[PDB]
């Protein structure tokens, strides 16, 4: 009959077909994550293979349906999502090599190790030992030549290759109607017809960059203290008005500032919020722990973990004789399958961890309904932040005492509260410019607004003007330091990391509002609140359905992006930091360096 | 009194091919079956007692399909599979099959249909398996418009309870 109730006919045999072949890919997937074997990791492969295929068939098989002649959005949403080209849209040889340009990025990255020059016996890998130094060690050079040698090896290696994989993918992305590569990406935020709701690839850098404004006041100010907390640890090898040393930020890329808490500490006096040693006192196992964690989504009006996920679950690591790969994650694998792998220990981490991974898993039931193609969060964004508003609520102090973990009578020193929101800013907010720079020079590369022959010269002039942080040797086109960053040379949207950050704000405020919190926002804990929970599972529950403007409304009650939850949550460190930097000079010269000497 | 024939029966049919066995002149109690928390379900509708005086279909479905072997109900099973007249009736019986009807590797004998023109009348049937064109055309698969009209359930072992395999009985009243 008519194209629409014909193409509702065929996304109907798509998503009952989908379903099914994918649960074969996750359960092999599942298999190998858990009994790592040879038999295993190569059934990992044929479902694995036999997916990209039964996908391959049905994208170009949906083609067939005019994107134009439609109009049950639902199905519209559904179909743009399967005819998506990609790889297609390419000659055979321009997609094999793109292909090919991407695995060694992949495996030269994973496989990267460095030579210490002062024992070539002993070359260690990025993770660990190189992570490690950058994490760890206190001395400028030791330090110095960790981040150099990377950037130096491996950066140079993945130059030519970068060089010819930005073009391979423009091509790609012009070819389906595209500005360019990050026009792709941006993609992702895009949302057309439903009026009062729509969003453009430009409307996102148009928001991105008047939201990251209102961060600079912050962002300079936990700067400026942290450099001066800095020239103690390195007296003499940093300026009190200048950038900082990239390779003194604690990681290898300075992404986040986590690490210099023991530097940084703004009261080193005060000590743990950690009931690690609580927990194992009072005997808790594996167990215990999610099912805590359950009785904490209960409490706001949301259901038990299924019988499945308990009976499928691995809450332990089996040890030796049975190997497992341990990152932390949540599965969806469908059919009502949902399963954490968590190598438990009996950690605040890990509690708060299961906190998070459980909240996923939440989320990927609340959308289970929606049909197999919408079964995912709003946006790229969504996921993880759902995900981490668990670990806010989780970590306030009130939450660890009703529950017997936090000994009844401990009393909030103002000064512990500006500790742990220091040690958020270090991480939450340290991340912010670092990001949103990273992927404007993506962009700028891939709107051509790069010259081959300048890339270092733009990546560092930006690192000076939008991060405040300089490199401690002069970098020119033989490196690429950009890809020296898994994200990058690894094909992947990092800005992502920028609105769920937001998002992540957006949410707990809205959420603490309704459970009525009275404190600061963040001494927020959203248990025991069903009327809360009501609110956010009234996103939870469209999935990739709706635009996410109207998922986010429902949330925050707004149709767009806003930081102002984000400097509410850091309001009591941030006038803090505004009276430690009485004396201190806020901003930064582009000019200084460490070298040249 | 033959009810051991079918609850209790080994082998049981997809619900596109429903069985329908009759019962006359036996005489039962149906204190049989009234006491036991081995079935999940048993809705009945109109009834329940013993007068001592019938038909009895059997099949298997997806444990969130249950909810449509019931009067009115949502469709695919109940559109397309069995359906159950808003009048007549007697009681409707479901019990997890999970350790029988599934397997670690996956079983997909069971299946059903979720491509027709029409709705079946009440205890209709059809068994037909005949290339799905939404228009009548002959067909031809995968011609851009040919489906077979059978699917297969897939149970597996490790599946929520919503897609584990139920055994159902219903009961009608003559
Ligand atoms: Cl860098
Ligand atoms: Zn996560």
Known sequence: ?597 | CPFGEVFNATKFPSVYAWERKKISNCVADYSVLYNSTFFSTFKCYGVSATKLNVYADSFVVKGDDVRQIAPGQTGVIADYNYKLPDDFMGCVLAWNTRNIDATSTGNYNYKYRFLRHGKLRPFERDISNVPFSPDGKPCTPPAFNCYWPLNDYGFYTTTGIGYQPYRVVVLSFE
């Open chain 1, 1 to 597: 009959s008519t194209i629409e109730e014909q193409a509702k006919t065929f996304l109907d045999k798509f998503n009952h077909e989908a379903e099914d072949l994918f649960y074969q890919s996750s359960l092999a997937s599942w298999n190998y994550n858990t009994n790592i074997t040879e038999e295993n990791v190569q059934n990992m492969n044929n479902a694995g293979d036999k997916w990209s295929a039964f996908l391959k068939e049905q994208s170009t098989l949906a083609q067939m349906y005019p994107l134009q002649e439609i109009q049950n959005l639902t199905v519209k949403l559904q179909l743009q999502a399967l005819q998506q080209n990609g790889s297609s849209v390419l000659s055979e040889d321009k997609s094999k090599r793109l292909n090919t340009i991407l695995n060694t990025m992949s495996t030269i990255y994973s496989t990267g190790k460095v030579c210490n020059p002062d024992n070539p016996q002993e070359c260690l890998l990025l993770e660990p030992g190189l992570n490690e130094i950058m994490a760890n060690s206190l001395d400028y050079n030791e330090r110095l030549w960790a981040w150099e040698s990377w950037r130096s090896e491996v950066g140079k290696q993945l130059r030519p290759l970068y060089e010819e994989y930005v073009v391979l993918k423009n091509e790609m992305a012009r070819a389906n109607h595209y500005e360019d590569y990050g026009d792709y990406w941006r993609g992702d935020y895009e949302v057309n017809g439903v009026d009062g709701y729509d969003y453009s690839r430009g409307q996102l850098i148009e928001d991105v960059e008047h939201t990251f404004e209102e961060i600079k006041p912050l962002y300079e100010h936990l700067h400026a203290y942290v450099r001066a907390k800095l020239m103690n640890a390195y007296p003499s090898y940093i300026s009190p008005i200048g950038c900082l040393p990239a390779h003194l930020l604690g990681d290898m890329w300075g992404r986040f500032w986590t690490n210099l808490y023991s530097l940084t500490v703004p009261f080193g006096q005060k000590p743990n919020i950690d009931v690690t040693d609580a927990m194992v006192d009072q005997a808790w196992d594996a167990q215990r722990i999610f099912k805590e964690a359950e009785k904490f989504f209960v409490s706001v009006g949301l259901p038990n973990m299924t019988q499945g996920f308990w009976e499928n679950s691995m809450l332990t690591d089996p040890g030796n004789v049975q190997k497992a790969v341990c990152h932390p994650t949540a599965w969806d694998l469908g059919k009502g399958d949902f399963r954490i792998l968590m190598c438990t220990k009996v950690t605040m981490d890990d509690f708060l961890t299961a906190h998070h991974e459980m909240g996923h898993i939440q989320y990927d039931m609340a959308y289970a309904a929606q049909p197999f193609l919408l079964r995912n969060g709003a946006n790229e964004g969504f996921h993880e932040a759902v995900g981490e508003i668990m670990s806010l609520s989780a970590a306030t102090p009130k939450h660890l005492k009703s529950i017997g973990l936090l000994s009844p009578d401990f009393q909030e020193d103002n000064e512990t509260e500006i500790n742990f929101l220091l040690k958020q800013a270090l991480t939450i907010v340290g991340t912010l410019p670092f990001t949103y720079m990273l992927e404007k020079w993506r962009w700028m590369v891939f709107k051509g607004e790069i010259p081959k022959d300048q890339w270092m010269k733009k990546w560092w002039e930006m690192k000076r003007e939008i991060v405040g942080v300089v490199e401690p040797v002069p970098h020119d086109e033989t490196y690429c330091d950009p890809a020296s960053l898994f994200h990058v040379s690894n094909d992947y949207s990092f800005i992502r990391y920028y609105t769920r950050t937001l998002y992540q704000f957006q949410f707990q405020e809205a959420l603490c509002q309704a459970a009525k919190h009275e404190g600061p926002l963040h001494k927020c804990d959203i248990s025991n609140s069903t009327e809360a929970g009501q609110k956010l599972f009234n996103m939870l529950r469209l999935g990739k359905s709706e635009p996410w403007t109207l998922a986010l409304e429902n949330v925050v009650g707004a149709k767009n992006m806003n930081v102002r939850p984000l400097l509410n949550y850091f309001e009591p460190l941030f006038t803090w930091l505004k009276d430690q930097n009485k004396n201190s000079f806020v901003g930064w010269s582009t000019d200084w360096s460490p070298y040249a000497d």
